[model samples]
Structure formats: C-alpha cells, structure tokens
Target: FTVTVPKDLYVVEYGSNMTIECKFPVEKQLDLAALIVYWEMEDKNIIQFVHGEEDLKVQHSSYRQRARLLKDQLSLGNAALQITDVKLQDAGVYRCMISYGGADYKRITVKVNAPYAAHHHHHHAA
Candidate 1:
C-alpha cells in the first residue's frame, strides 16, 4: 500500500519555512521512470507540479523553484516537498498526486499566521 505525507500537521507563526513531504510505494509494482509523481497546492489558488525517478520537474509557476523532491528519499518512495520562503499567502490545503496505475491522491493542509501588526493592539508600560 502506497502512502503520502503519512499524516497531518499544524503550524503557527508568520514568515516561517515549512517542508511538507509526500510519497508512495511502487518499487516492485511499477517503473519509477514511467510513474509521474506530482504535487498540488489547493489554496486560494490552484497549482500543479510533477516529477519522476529520472529528475525532479516543476510543472507550474506557483511551485516553480518553490518545490523540491528528496532524491535520496524518492528511491525509498518519498515525494516530500521542501517549501522554502513560505508566506501567509501559502497557507491553505495542498494535495499530492501519484500517477502510476491511474492515480492516487492525498490531502494536506498548511497554516500560516497573518501579520500581527495588522491588528490593533494596546501597549502599556509596567
């Protein structure tokens, strides 16, 4: 049985980097090269990115260099995404798709905090 992310996560704070990992198990079942693995961000905007055993490829602008695959882990059936420069706009749901014998999909969510200063606050001196 193949799996992606394996579980869920909760994140807090703004301007923090988050690396979401996704993967599948298809070594004896299918050719890694033939299988097209992909990552999708299902936030306010939608985007798709695809990769394979040969090389990691970005299939969309939203995920361009922002996405990365762990080659070492890929051999062990890992398609985790190391999302750098994560911003508030990046907060939302994300899905990872594995296409070998048709398609398998997994859903995950990312939470980011809004700028604290944006809210009105009172300061007092002790």
Candidate 2:
C-alpha cells in the first residue's frame, strides 16, 4: 500500500477550484472497479467512494454540493479530490485514504485566499 501527495500543500483563491492531490498504486485500469477512497477535513466527512461509486448520503452537507472525485484519473491511481468554489473556511488539512487489497493515506494542506474587497474590484471588473 504505497501512497503519496503530488504536493504537500495547495493554495487557491476564493471562488476557485482547488485540488487536494494524492496518488496510489494501480496495476490495471480495471482495478478501479473496486477502488475505495475516503476524504475528510477537520473531522468533517468530505466524500467517500466504495466499489468505485460515491456514497453521497454519507457526505458532509457543507461539501455535499462541491466535493467530487474524478474517474478519468482514478484509473491512473489518482486518488485526489477536487473542491469547487473554494472558500476561506475550507482552509485546513485534508486526509485522503485509499483502499483496495491494502490501504494508504495522505494528509495535504489547502489554503484559500480571501477575495479582494468590492471597492478594489471596481478598479476593473472581469
């Protein structure tokens, strides 16, 4: 059970997408058929997948709408998680756990930069 993070920390701005990267070992793409992944932050459940399918009922309401795992890369043993519309409150360490025949987990940090004030935005709007 080997696991590691693509990087130890990720920083993003508010209202942006942030990825907590983690990777594990995979022999065949077919291995995702039984891939199990669980991610949590500050004791709150973010998301969990069993048999390669998500268990939405067990996810935390705060992230119920924004947390997601990608199957496109899951086949590559990319067990990372993506949190959309990241907020300052989401700044913290997240745990990514993976399981198949054995299991391994990685703890990664995320930092969110607060959006610029409204007055400053008026300087130039997108």
Candidate 3:
C-alpha cells in the first residue's frame, strides 16, 4: 500500500557512485524471484529487473554502461538504482517503478557536483 524513499534529494559528486534507493510495502515479506522494477529518468529508461533478471534491451544509451539494480537487496523491499561514475548530466529527477502485488512509482532528485570538501578553506586570518 506504500512506496518509500529515505530522502527526496541526493547530492553526489562527479565521478562518484550514486544510488537512488526505494522501498515498497512488504509487511508479509517479499521474494527476489517475484521482483519487477524499472528505473527511469522521465521517459528514458535506465534499467529494468523482470522476475529477478535484468532486462535492458531498451535502456537509454547514456545510462547503458553504468546503470544497475542492486540484486542482493531486491527481495528486501528494495528497488535501488546504482549509477557508477556520476556526471554533471546525471543530476535530475528519477522515477522508480516497482511492480509486485501492486504498482508504485517514486521520484527522487539527484544532483551531481563537487561535495563541500571540494572547496578550499578560506577562514585563515594572518
């Protein structure tokens, strides 16, 4: 009856690995073999898991090489998306579409840039 994501926004540095995590209602518990999930950026599909296997025949060209679904956490009500080598263009909203006993769509925001530590400290006073 519900879909959940820990945070609405994620800021990942360029070249860093980015994960967009989502969870579905599984009070009675769930199984990996029954998982069907899709990750997309608007109309462009990123990745897909059908019956516990990856189906990427139509995956968007930009994400073809770096997008994946975390398999170990699949049955844990997890529909997490992993994008290796986060880039400037990767910053945007993503949708996680999960289908099991029911269907759910969750949106998450991602930003790609330098982390706070990237800037030089300027508090020095001579």
Between prediction 1 and prediction 2, the one with superior TM-score is 2
- Candidate 2 lDDT tens digits, 15-98: 899777788878765475667899999999898888768889989988988999876788787876888988666889999988
TM-score of each: 0.68, 0.86, 0.83
Report the C-alpha lDDT of model 3 over 1-126, residue by residue, as the tens digit: 578899979988877898889988766667666568888886798988887779988889989889998877865777789999876668889999888777888899997675444322211211
lDDT of 1 by residue, 33-119 (tens): 556666667632233333444343334565556656555566666667767766565677787777766678788888776566522
Better of 2 and 3 by lDDT: 2
Q: CA lDDT, every prediction? A: 0.61, 0.81, 0.81
| Candidate 1 regions with alpha-carbon error over 4 angstroms | 27-30, 43-59, 118-126
lDDT of 1 at 38: 61
Error of 1 at 120 (Å): 10
* Model 2 whole-model lDDT (C-alpha atoms): 0.81
Clashes of 1: 2
Top candidate when judged by TM-score against the true structure: 2
Provide the global lDDT of candidate 3 against the true structure: 0.81
Model 3 ranges with Cα > 4 A deviation? 32-34, 114-126
- Of 1 and 3, the candidate ahead on lDDT is 3
Using TM-score as the yardstick, the better of models 1 and 3 is 3
